[PDB]
Each structure stands twice: as structure tokens, then as C-alpha cells.
Design a binder for this molecule. Structure first.
Ligand SMILES: Cn1c(=O)n(CCCO)c(=O)c2c1nc(Oc1ccc(/N=N\c3ccccc3)c(OC(F)(F)F)c1)n2Cc1ccc(Cl)cc1
Ligand SMILES: Cn1c(=O)n(CCCO)c(=O)c2c1nc(Oc1ccc(/N=N\c3ccccc3)c(OC(F)(F)F)c1)n2Cc1ccc(Cl)cc1
Ligand SMILES: Cn1c(=O)n(CCCO)c(=O)c2c1nc(Oc1ccc(/N=N\c3ccccc3)c(OC(F)(F)F)c1)n2Cc1ccc(Cl)cc1
Lengths: 644, 145, 645, 126, 46
């Protein structure tokens, strides 16, 4: 082929020297060329380049101020040179330009928006002093999607927030919340919005780090009862703000208000006599033993010791000393001592659901678990009373008919004991070693639940196939037992329910091989059934159950990367539940003229410190040894031209 | 027919990428079958060559490994290839390596070969499939959107 | 505390201005400050900055040769200044210094060694031109004797020194990497440093070989000193980077091969079908039509492969019931007569390769000891079968034979023998591009499992000892026609040490029940202790040891899989090179230099002089190439301004 | 204050014993990261640079007489037994110290070593 | 012991100053040195 030049022209033969004059820099020639071309001398001072650079767009490129002044002295077309100067980060050029179809920017980018994009303090200052106004975010779909993302990038710049916002803390919490929600309804631009939200969360952390005394810290968190803004930082999920070392040293002094086996004994001793402290809190709460259960650390231990005693009662309900077999029995001695705890739990949930009735209540795991456990306990209590008034009398247990209330009540009560002892897991966030382990093991669980939409599909398909094959050979002659839960397993694939039960117990290898035979000499269907069972055993344990452990490893690294701010956030949430008054008794029992000026002064000092730190962290860094070399020759140049 | 519903997972923002990444770490498993199929064939040949002299079907209603009293496990090549496949899941008992004779030398050799097959395929061959699938998922997740 | 300056003597008054003028580059100030010739106002020209720097050394670090020459003309003490200039890589300073107690360098360091360490082509050339010599690498103050030895081996193993003062840079890069590899095993402390010096010698040969411009020069190197005589030397020295180069690999593939997925397997099978035709064709008339068609390595490989699948096919047919019932001491069947030629060919090949290498680097390979064991088993099978025939006769029921009968032992050994034969078919995966790298990496992830076998073999022994000690007093065999764990009612799992060892092995796979821990007595304390020890053994092995064997086979598939294409290609080259010569072109069934030196040394100079150029003119650029642009502009401006006035 | 006391250029300049004052200053900075767990990554990172200072200072030995004098200051190998009590892992695992320890310890190929090992082990009562 | 320790400290400082001054910061010093030398020569010429 022959390579040619398509859709292009030539610039000039005399304007090349004029452009090279400003490319290298020489006042004499540059001035002369412009001066001699005053009376229509056909030089086209508004030149062009193969790169598309006009004369003005070249002096600004090299930042030479004298050349810019000389060019702007004459009548030269500027076009969009202001935006180029703003993007190039030249303060002198924009200062000169402020007081004085083909474009490289979309026709919506105003100078203020571009300056906010560049995130420069001085240029934004100059533009705001002149007077600007960004629009308010709220046919041409492509235009409209690159017209709200540009606005939110300008609004989320730290330099603009710290300069034209009454309260940078509030405007950082709410802005990151709006951006986070916008990332959902905007699936195409998901990565861009989520990065802005993480940008706004670090701004509050950086602004909080500029506190040099505990007095200044308490004025920020308690603004507008106690720790009022610290609770607001949790409603907006500001994990970085909460997990600041100062905000964690302050909370520790309110919480606590030594070797391991000098503290374990102390904890067990202080939890040994919780009823004494609870009684003293209600009979003589003045100093000695009435406000000793008011320290949050002691209150946490007392509440834990009551929960451990509740579990110890559930483990004594199965003892034989505490038991005849009669229909509708009277409640035993243990159940009367268990009833107060259940009533306390239900009442505590009732007096905590009023903040929002199912509104953000059922969002976390533990609230749903508590709701299920309380429903099960209510059903047990209802059934045990239903069974008392009608189904009374003494009769051997083996002669009872199924669905008897005394059996369903016991089954529901036994199911609810599992959830009661699994609530003891949530008390691990308070420990330094077992704390981060629980959070990592609880966030590496939404991935597991995504494999159970493929495993269930495979199970359903294979169960349907096996049942369709084997359902014609059902037999029930000379059999006391019928199912896979017998000594001699039979009828494993005779129905869809038993088929679904058999293909689940084969994961653990509890299904024998002879269940694939029939009471006939049909040796072709037996081989097909065995092949189906073997194929299921192949892709359930080698393929599908090895890709589950292969993706846990590649998602645990991401979770464990930032897994210490989350544990501290969870621990702070747990701690702050024991600070407020109300609910200080265990389940066994209980059944602005000023202050707006100091805050402003502290906030302005914080903003001053933040800007004085950001300018030095951005200007200096390896760029400090570049401006020095300019000065080194500038001083010599001035000295030389003084003598010349 | 019911296994084509997984092809509709490429419409959900959560189950979508999982299916695509799951079907890409599957040509690696296919390359690993060519070694297991050779080890299985070698050990089946050895076990059948040792045990084919002791076949018997006297006074037994069933014959093979798929009945309650497993017998004639290594009498032919088909039953030997089936017996070494079900031993991965532990569904083959240990009394199938016996004969109706007092030949303890051949029984010990058969048991040793069965144990050697168990070691190779369960702790040396199924731990290299995990190790090489765990180091191949990271590349698939770099370009999965 | 009241911090003070301890162990520091002083400085002087005047010398500070001297050093400041030297550092700032003021020529006139230093010139007048040096003019106290032989009448000095107590100003020491050998003053030492508290940091150790001297005026001569300061000028070296600023490479201002005017002050350097002025100081040299004034007889300033030099000391170890040449070494500093060499390390700083200043050509002019070395040039000037070459024509004329606290030390910063080790006492055994010489300028040539330091220059070789810095790898500077110009300084090395200048030093060699004047006449130098490295000591002989070839015990009282062992600290400096081991340090001196490492200094000289680091100088010799340098690309710039090797290709300026070596007769054959290709041959000296092979012996040097080999010697440094075996020198890292006698010096365990400095192991990490010797084996890195060896790695840069292997890459030097590959880089030098990569400068070939056409196939004419490439084949001149590989054939130096019968054919491909310098490609068998690289394999002998394990130069994996040199061998696995695209230019060499393409030549090897052209020599080997001499189509799509569905069109290649079918024709390979078709060619393999007529295996016995073009072997007798070669035997009778070695002509270009058929006799020379087996001489193509790709065809010989297929014929030698299709001749092995035939061995396995009738190996599977030797156990069919159709083909010598239960007769004591039988005559060989119709299949083993067909088996005998292949076995005899394998044994003859092993015998002929035994004396060709002298059991050194021959038994040192994974795939060459399995062959020895297999052939020993095949020989013992015959040795027992012939003994059975000559001393036994008569048809006797099999159930009545006494144990250790020669027939049973012979057939057991034969059954064990033909497992290795089928497992040796694994070594034919290196020829495939898909299964090749996978198979090579699997065999290197298996020498780490062998280390996770001294922990398990000790845990097993420790627990078996305790279990046998507990349970050896309750053994019984009355009312039991069957004894041992290998029956339908396991009864004596932990009675003897031999039984205990093999009862804790099957428990890993879950084939040992729980009632084996009971006794025929109501001693619930002993039974509970035995069950607790069995459970503790199950926890340690199946949860701890076997979950960290997979966790250390995952931090060893990131290093092995890092460089896997080189290892696979080296193995494939070693496989290909065995089908190039004459002598082995017979399946076991059918087996029963004045001008050359001139040309070589002429192309070698071109290769070396291209490598040095492509090294210097790439080390210069690899930000640095534009730093000298500003200095060039400054020098031009200075010269112009000075010359104008 | 601890970030200043643990600077290599100040220990060298104004300490009587840069070895001893780097063992102590790294032990305190490790047990102080447990009482100040809020500032934990800053107190233990400050302790990991005090272990490398001693290693880099011992790395400057030139002969086997200088190395022998240091390790036997204040019976034998007194300084090395002190560096073990403070858990100085980088100080002990140095090629020169390891070479000296091996020379004191031992005072061939794979197939020739275990043979004489068993030979010596058989006659352990003799 | 003191005689050995003084040498150890001195040669540790001599190496740390090298590794800090040199380590492309070395290239920036040479440019400034050339500029200063040119400036001084020009000032001393006129
Ligand atoms: C599905 N099936 C099956 O039901 N029965 C029982 C039927 C009677 O009850 C088998 O005996 C069987 C089988 N498959 C087999 O051969 C494999 C083995 C493993 C495979 N794969 N992966 C792994 C992965 C990890 C560990 C082990 C294996 C595989 O690939 C596959 F298609 F994906 F299954 C195919 N055999 C063995 C056999 C018997 C007779 C003959 Cl003539 C030929 C083969
Ligand atoms: C292959 N085999 C086998 O078939 N039977 C059944 C025959 C009887 O029916 C065994 O009983 C047996 C065995 N091997 C054994 O001892 C081991 C075990 C594991 C080793 N290694 N690794 C692993 C890795 C992962 C899981 C399990 C094991 C190992 O490693 C070695 F020392 F290098 F050989 C040696 N025993 C037990 C025994 C019997 C007699 C004696 Cl005197 C000594 C020991
Ligand atoms: C060793 N043993 C055992 O032999 N028998 C059988 C004896 C009779 O057949 C047990 O029944 C048993 C047990 N151990 C137990 O409790 C654990 C479990 C796991 C532990 N550890 N790790 C792992 C690791 C991975 C997976 C599983 C477990 C552990 O160790 C501990 F951490 F120190 F506690 C202790 N029980 C159950 C039991 C019975 C009676 C009582 Cl009163 C209390 C408990």
C-alpha cells in the first residue's frame, strides 16, 4: 500500500519562524514580528500548529509571562485560553487573563468548575472573589450524564468546600451520602461516583486530625446530648472519622472510667455478684454500690453474666432430676425461672422497635435473629398453654399421635435454644484478638450465599432426573422403616422429597451405595441411576465445592486489607449502647447563644491548619528541587542585567 | 433441560460475573483429568491382574459393589474401574480386598495397592487441583466486568 | 539527659573558608587560598571535614576538573582517591589520577576489582590497557578470607570484563555459572549471594546469543567443535535460558518437524497405525521412499509411541478369563510369549545405557530409577516362573496352596511390575504444548510434599506406640474365623504394632469404624482413653497437618509457575535431542579446524561489539539522557559568553 | 520524645555504647505498644528500626579480631547471650556471627555424612 | 572495645552519609554546581 496524508493541509513558510521564535523565546524577534505586521501584512498572528497550538496557546504553555503580556497588549483572539491556563495551573496567566468551531472542553465546563476539578486554592480564590455560581444538581442523554458528574466533582473538592461552606463537617457527611446513593441509580457510571464518596470520607478524617488538645476535640464531637456529632457520624457511616486514634482514646476513658490473669479473675469476680449490685442500685443508689453499675464497663460485665446464667438454666432443663411423661404437664421449676428472662428480652425489643417500626430495624443480622427467637418463644408459650386446658391426662408417650401440642411445643422450644446460644457470638467484638476475626468471618459470608443459587439449581435438576427415573419402583412390603434414616436404607429416590433429602446427605458421605438397586433384574436402569448419582457426586464436591474455597481466598485478601477500621467501628457502636441512661438493669430485673462561637473559632483554626498542610504536601512533593534551580539562575540573570 | 437455567444468570448484576468466572476456571480442570485417567487406568490394570484369579459367584444373590454385602470388587476390569471411582468418596469398604482362601500375601499386596491409589489421588492429586485453581482465579477476576 | 559530643577531636578556622570555596566552585578563591607555597599561615591543605570529606574528594564528587587539576599540581596528598573516582564513575578524574589510619574501602580491594564491580566499560578498558591482573581465586582470620574470595568472583562474573578479556565469552560464561552454583553449597552463610552471581552469568549468554542477525550466524555458534556440539554442552551445564531462546527453538523445531485440531490427531493416528510396516521397511531396504521416512524425528517418535500403546493393550488382555485355570506351575500362556520381546528390548536398552554413562547422572533422575525397578521386577517374574515349572507339577485346587508358593509370588510381582509401566506413560506429556508445562510444574511441587512426610511419619509412630501400649493386653482370637481390620467385623485394630500402624492409616479415609475401640470387658476408663487418643490423632492429621499441606502448596505454585515456560522448553529440548541421532531407530519389538575457528572468531567479534554497543547506548538512556542536555546547554552558553569577551 | 531518642544519627553521636542503648530502646518500644494500643503501629514500627541499627553497625566489621572482641565483652560469648535475651533476631542471624558459631560448633556429601553420624551414635556409651 | 567501637561508628556514619546524599538527587547537585561556577566566573570577569 501507499501511505498518504489524508484531510490535512500546510501551515506556512514564513509563519514557521514566527512560531519558533516563541517556541525558543526571544523578545526582540517576537515583538518585531508582531509590530511589523500591524498594517495587514498577511502574517496571520493567530497561527496554527500541527498539534493545533495557536500563538497565545504557546506562551501560556511555557508560562513565559513577558511573552503573554506582549501578546495580550495587541488585539489577539483569546477564545478559550482562560480554560487552558486554568488547567495548566498557571496563576500568572489566569491573573492576566481575568482582567483583560473547535474546543478542547465540553460546552458545559465553566472556569469555576474546571478550577474545582484542578483543585487549586489560589485560582479558586481568585474566581470566587470575582463572583461565580455553580449550578444546582437535579433529551440529550449523553450530555445530561456528563453534566451532573462534572458538577459533583466540583462540589466534592476539598479546596472549594473549605472555602465556601459554613460547616465543612456537615457538608462532607451529606455529600458522600448523596453520591453513594447516586452510584446505585446510575449503573453505567458506578466506579466514578463511588470514588467521590471515598474522597469525601477522607476529607473529614484529615480535617479532624488537626486537633492539638482534648478541649478542641470535645467541642467538635459534642456540638449541637453528649457526643451529639459522634452519633451523627455513625448514622452516615463515617468509618474513617470514628476510627481516629483520638476518638478512640476519648471513648476508652469513658468506657473504663495489667496481665491477662490479673484481669480475668477481676472480671469473673465483678460478674459473680451482679444481683447484689442490681439490688443496691434500686434500694440505695447514692455512692458506694448504687452508681457502681453505672460505669459502662461494669454494666457490660453484669449484662453478660446474666446471659450466661440464662444459658445455664437451659442446660439444666434437660436434666432428669428436674420428669414424668404425661399430656399437658404443669410448668417445671426451671421454666418459672426462665420466664423472666424471656419477658425481659421481649420487653427490651418492644422498647427498641419504637424508633422505627420495622424501619431500618430489620437490616442487621442480630435484630432478625432476635425477632425470630422471640417469635419462637411466644409460640412455645402459646402452645404450652393451649395443651394445658384441653389435652390433659396421663398416657404413654409412644402411644401419642403426632402433631400433639406437647410435641410441637417441645420442638419449637428446642429450636429456640440454638438461636439463644448463637447470640453469644456478637459479644466477641469487644475483644482485641477475637474481634477482627468475627468481622472478617461475617463479611466473608455474602459470597457464600451467591454459590447457593447455583448449587440449589444443580440439586434441583439432578433430583428431578433421579426421581423421574426411579419413581416407578416404589415398594413397601415387609418393611418397618421407610426412608434413608433406617438401618437398611431403602426408597431413597422414590419421591421428590426423599430424593432431595438423599442428594443432600451424600455431600457428607452418609448414603450407602446399595440404595440404587431395585427389586427386579432390570440391570440397565440401575446403571443409569448409579451413573446419575456418581455424576452428581462428581460436580458437587470436586468442581462446585472447590470453586467455593478458591474464591474465599481471593476475597479474604480484600476484606482483611481494611479490616481494622471496621472492627473499631463495630466496637464503638457496641460501646455507645452502654453509655446512655435507660436499660441499666439486667433482664432478670427491671420487669445556643454561646458554644456557637468557640466552635466557629476551632473550625476556622482547623481549616487554616488543613490548608497550610495541604499546600506544603502538594507543592513540595520532589518538586522542591525544581523551583530552586529556577531561582539559582534567576538571581544570576538579574545580577547580570543590572550591570548590563 | 434444567441445567440451562444457569445460562440466564447473565442478566443479574450479582450472579452474572460469578457464572462467567466459574466457566473460565473450567478448562483448567479439563487439563487435569488426563493425569487422573492415567493413574486410575494403571492401578485398575494392576488390581485386576492381581485379583482376577479369585472370581466366584457361588451362593450369592447379588454380585458387585452395589449391594449390601460387597463382593467381587476386583474380578473384572469394569468392576475394577468402578471400584476405584467410588473409593474417592469412601463408598467402598475394606473387606472387599479379601478372598475365600488363606493367602495373606496376595491380600496384603492388594490392600497395599489400594492404599497407594488412595494416597496418590486424594492427598497428592486433589491438593494440586486446589492449588492451581486458586492461582488461576486471580487472573480471571482482573478482567471480569 | 545532657547530651554531649563524645569522641570528636576538632576542626580549624581558616580551612572552613577553603572547603566552602572548593564546594561552591569558585576557582579564583581556591587559587589564591593555595598560593601560600612553602610559607603557610598554619593552613593545612589536607584538612578533613567532620564528615570525612576532603577538598580533593569534594572536587571529585562535583567533577569540576579545573579545581582537580589545580589541586593535583600542588602535590596534595591523594590516599585512596583513585578508588573513590572509580566508584563515582568519573572518567576524567580517573584519567587525571592515573598519570601522577581510616580507610573507606576493604584492604583487599584493588582498582581493577572495584572497576569490574562497578561494570564501567571505559574505566575497565583504560585499566586493562595500562596492565593489570586479577588474583587467582584458588584459614587464619576467616572473616577476611571469605570476604576476599567473594570480591574476586564478583569481578570475574561481570559482562563488561568478560567480553573484553576473554578468548571465548560463550564458554567462560558456562564454567563460571556452574562453579558459582556449587560454591553456594559449601558456603552456607553466603548462599544467597553466590547463587545470584550465577544467575547473571546465565542471562549474559542469552543476551550475547540474541545479537545474531540471520540464520547463517546462528548455526555457526551451535555447531562449534559432531552436530550441534555446543547445544549439548549447554544442556550439560543446565543453561536453561540459553537453550530456551526463540531463535534456537525455531531451528530445533525445523530440525524436528522436517493442519488444525481435527486434522492433526487423525493423521497422527493414521501414521501410528502402520507401525510395523516402516520398521521392517527400514530393516530390509533403508531407502528414501520408506527407510528414510522413519528417520524423521516426528515419525520416529510416533512409531516409538504407537509401539508402547500396543504393549499396554495386550497387557490389559493378559488378565482375561478367555485366554490357564488353576494349574500349579503352568507353562507360559500365548500372551506372555508376545510380552517377552518388549521386555527383552527394554532390558537390553537399559543394559546398553548402563555402561554408556557409568551410573553417574544416569540413576540420578526420576524417570530412570523407575525403569530399573520395573526391569528388576520383570526379571524376578521370570526367575520365579522358571523355578516353579522345574520343581512343581500337577493340577491342585487354588484354595489348598500353601502360602509363599512360587506361583503366587511370581504373579504378585508381575501385577506390581505392570503398574510402573503404565505410570511411565506420563513422561510423554512434555511433547504437548498444553499438558507439558502442567506436568513439569506438578513434579516440582512434589519435592515439598516429601518434606511434609517426616512430620506425619513421626505423629503416626507416636500415636501408634501409645495405642498399642494401651490395647495390647486385650487381644483375643477365640470364636473369630477372621482377624484384623480387613474383615467385615473389625476386632483387633490396636492389638499389635504392625496392625496399629496400618489401622491409623486407613482412618484418614474414614474406613475404620468406632466399635474397634471397645473391649470384651466393662472397663469404661480404658475405652474412653483409647477413643480420646484416636480422636486426638484424627484432629491433628485431618484438620491441622492436612490443611497446612495445602496451604504450603499454594505459596509454592507462585514461584514454580513464575518461570515455567523455560523449564518446559528445556525438558522438551532434552526430549527432542534423543530422536536426532542414529542407533536407536528401532522399536523394542523390532530390536530384540583452521577455517572453522576463523569463521567462529570472526562472528564472535561482531556479536561482542554489537552487545557492548546495545548495552552502553541503552544504559545511558535507562531521564538521564536529558539531564546531560541541560548541562550541554549550560556549557555551550558558558563557552560562547566567555569566548565573546 | 521516643521518635527522637530512636534516631540512628543521634545514638551514634551522643551515646556511650550504641549497642547496649539499642537493645534497651527496642525492648521498651515493644512493651510500650501494648499499654498504648491506640498508638500501636507507630510504637512497634519505631522498634523495628532499632533492631536494624545494631545489625547495620555490626555489619561494618573488617576482620575476625574485631568481631571476636565485640561478642565477648563483659563467660564466653557474653554479648551474644545478651542479644538473645532481648530477642535481637537480626543481630544474631548475620553471616559473620553465623560463620563464627559454625566454626565453634563443628570444631562431604549426603551419602557420606549420615554413615559417620550413625557410626558415632552407635558407640555413645563407649 | 572503645577503639573498635569508634572505628565502627565512624565507618557507619561515612556509609550513611554516602547512601543519603547520593540516594537521582546526585544529578541535581551537579547542575547547581555548574550554574554557580558559571555565575562566579561571569561575576569575576566583569
Ligand atoms: C460418572 N461416573 C460414574 O457414575 N461411575 C459409576 C457408574 C457405575 O456405578 C464410574 O464408575 C465412572 C464415572 N466416571 C468415570 O471416569 C471418570 C472419573 C473421573 C472423572 N472426573 N473427575 C475427577 C476429579 C477428581 C477426582 C476424581 C475424578 C471423569 O470425568 C467426568 F466425566 F467429569 F466425570 C470420569 N468412572 C470410572 C469408569 C468406570 C468404568 C469405565 Cl469403562 C470407565 C470409567
Ligand atoms: C501405602 N500404605 C498402605 O497401602 N497400607 C495398607 C496396607 C495394609 O492393608 C498401609 O498400611 C500403610 C501404607 N503406608 C504406611 O505408612 C505410611 C503411611 C503414609 C505415608 N505418607 N504419607 C501420607 C500422606 C497423606 C496421607 C496419608 C499418608 C508414609 O510415607 C512413607 F513413610 F514415606 F512411606 C508411610 N502404612 C502403614 C504402615 C504399615 C506397616 C509399616 Cl511397617 C509401617 C507403616
Ligand atoms: C479429643 N476429643 C475426643 O477424642 N472425643 C471423643 C472421646 C469419646 O469418643 C470427644 O468427644 C471430644 C474431643 N474434644 C472435644 O471437644 C473438643 C473439640 C474440638 C477441639 N479442638 N479442635 C478442633 C479443630 C477443628 C475441628 C474440630 C475440632 C477441642 O480442643 C480444645 F480446643 F482444646 F477444646 C475439644 N470433644 C467433645 C467433648 C466431649 C465431652 C466434653 Cl465434657 C466436652 C467436649
Amino acid at each position: 500500500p501507499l501511505r498518504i496524508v489524508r484531510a490535512e493541509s500546510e501551515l506556512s513558510t514564513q509563519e514557521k519562524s514566527y512560531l519558533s521564535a516563541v517556541e525558543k523565546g526571544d523578545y526582540a524577534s517576537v515583538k518585531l514580528a508582531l509590530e511589523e505586521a500591524e498594517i495587514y501584512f498577511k502574517i496571520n498572528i493567530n497561527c496554527i500548529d500541527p498539534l493545533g497550538r495557536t500563538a497565545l496557546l504557546i506562551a501560556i504553555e511555557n508560562e513565559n509571562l513577558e511573552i503573554i503580556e506582549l501578546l495580550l497588549s495587541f488585539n489577539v483572539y483569546v477564545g478559550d485560553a482562560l480554560l487552558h491556563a486554568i488547567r495548566k495551573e498557571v496563576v500568572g496567566a489566569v491573573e492576566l487573563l481575568l482582567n483583560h468551531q473547535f474546543s478542547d472542553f465540553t460546552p458545559d465546563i465553566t472556569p469555576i468548575i474546571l478550577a474545582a476539578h484542578t483543585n487549586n486554592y489560589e485560582i479558586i480564590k481568585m474566581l470566587v472573589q470575582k463572583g461565580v455560581s455553580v449550578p444546582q444538581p437535579h433529551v440529550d442523554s449523553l450530555r445530561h450524564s456528563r453534566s451532573r458528574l462534572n458538577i459533583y466533582k466540583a462540589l466534592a473538592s476539598p479546596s472549594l468546600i473549605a472555602l465556601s461552606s459554613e460547616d465543612p463537617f456537615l457538608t462532607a457527611f451529606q455529600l458522600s451520602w448523596e453520591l453513594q446513593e447516586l452510584s446505585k441509580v446510575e449503573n453505567e457510571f458506578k466506579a466514578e461516583y463511588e470514588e467521590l464518596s471515598h474522597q469525601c470520607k477522607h476529607f473529614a478524617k484529615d480535617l479532624l486530625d488537626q486537633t492539638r488538645s482534648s478541649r478542641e476535640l470535645e467541642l467538635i464531637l459534642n456540638f449541637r446530648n453528649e457526643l451529639a456529632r459522634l452519633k451523627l457520624a455513625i448514622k452516615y457511616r463515617q468509618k474513617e472519622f470514628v476510627a481516629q486514634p483520638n476518638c478512640q482514646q476519648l471513648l476508652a476513658s469513658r468506657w473504663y472510667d495489667r496481665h491477662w490473669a490479673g484481669k480475668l479473675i477481676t472480671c469473673v469476680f465483678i460478674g459473680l455478684m451482679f444481683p447484689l449490685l442490681s439490688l443496691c442500685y434500686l434500694v440505695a443508689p447514692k455512692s458506694r454500690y448504687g452508681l457502681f453499675i453505672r460505669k459502662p464497663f461494669i454494666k457490660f460485665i453484669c449484662h453478660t453474666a446474666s446471659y450466661l446464667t440464662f444459658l445455664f438454666l437451659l442446660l439444666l432443663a434437660s436434666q432428669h432430676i428436674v420428669n414424668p411423661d404425661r399430656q399437658g404437664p404443669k410448668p417445671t421449676t426451671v421454666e418459672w425461672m426462665i420466664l423472666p428472662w424471656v419477658l425481659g428480652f421481649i420487653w427490651t425489643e418492644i422498647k427498641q422497635m419504637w424508633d422505627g417500626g420495622f424501619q431500618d430495624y430489620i437490616h442487621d443480622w442480630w435484630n432478625l435473629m432476635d425477632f425470630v427467637m422471640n417469635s419462637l418463644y411466644l409460640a412455645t408459650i402459646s402452645l404450652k398453654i393451649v395443651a394445658y386446658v384441653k389435652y390433659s391426662g396421663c398416657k404413654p408417650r409412644d402411644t401419642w399421635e403426632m402433631w400433639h401440642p406437647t410435641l410441637v411445643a417441645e420442638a419449637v422450644f428446642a429450636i429456640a435454644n440454638i438461636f439463644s446460644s448463637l447470640r453469644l457470638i456478637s459479644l466477641f467484638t469487644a475483644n482485641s484478638h477475637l474481634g477482627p476475626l468475627q468481622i472478617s468471618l461475617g463479611r466473608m459470608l455474602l459470597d457464600i450465599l451467591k454459590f447457593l443459587f447455583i448449587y440449589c439449581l444443580v440439586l434441583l435438576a439432578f433430583a428431578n432426573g433421579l426421581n423421574q427415573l426411579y419413581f416407578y419402583y416404589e415398594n413397601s412390603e415387609g418393611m418397618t422403616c421407610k426412608g434413608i434414616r433406617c438401618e437398611r436404607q431403602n426408597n431413597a429416590f422414590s419421591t421428590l422429597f426423599e430424593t432431595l433429602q438423599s442428594l443432600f446427605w451424600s455431600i457428607f458421605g452418609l448414603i450407602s451405595l446399595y440404595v440404587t438397586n431395585v427389586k427386579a433384574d432390570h440391570k440397565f436402569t440401575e446403571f443409569v441411576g448409579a451413573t446419575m448419582f456418581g455424576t452428581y457426586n462428581v460436580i458437587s464436591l470436586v468442581v462446585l465445592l472447590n470453586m467455593l474455597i478458591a474464591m474465599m481466598n481471593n476475597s479474604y485478601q480484600h476484606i482483611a486489607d481494611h479490616a481494622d477500621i471496621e472492627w473499631k467501628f463495630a466496637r464503638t457502636k457496641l460501646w455507645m449502647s452502654y453509655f446512655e441512661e435507660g436499660g441499666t438493669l439486667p433482664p432478670p430485673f427491671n420487669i445556643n447563644v454561646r458554644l456557637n462561637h468557640q466552635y466557629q473559632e476551632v473550625l476556622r483554626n482547623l481549616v487554616k491548619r488543613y490548608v497550610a498542610a495541604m499546600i506544603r504536601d502538594a507543592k513540595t512533593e520532589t518538586e522542591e528541587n525544581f523551583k530552586e534551580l529556577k531561582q539559582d539562575i534567576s538571581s544570576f540573570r538579574y545580577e547580570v542585567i543590572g550591570m548590563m
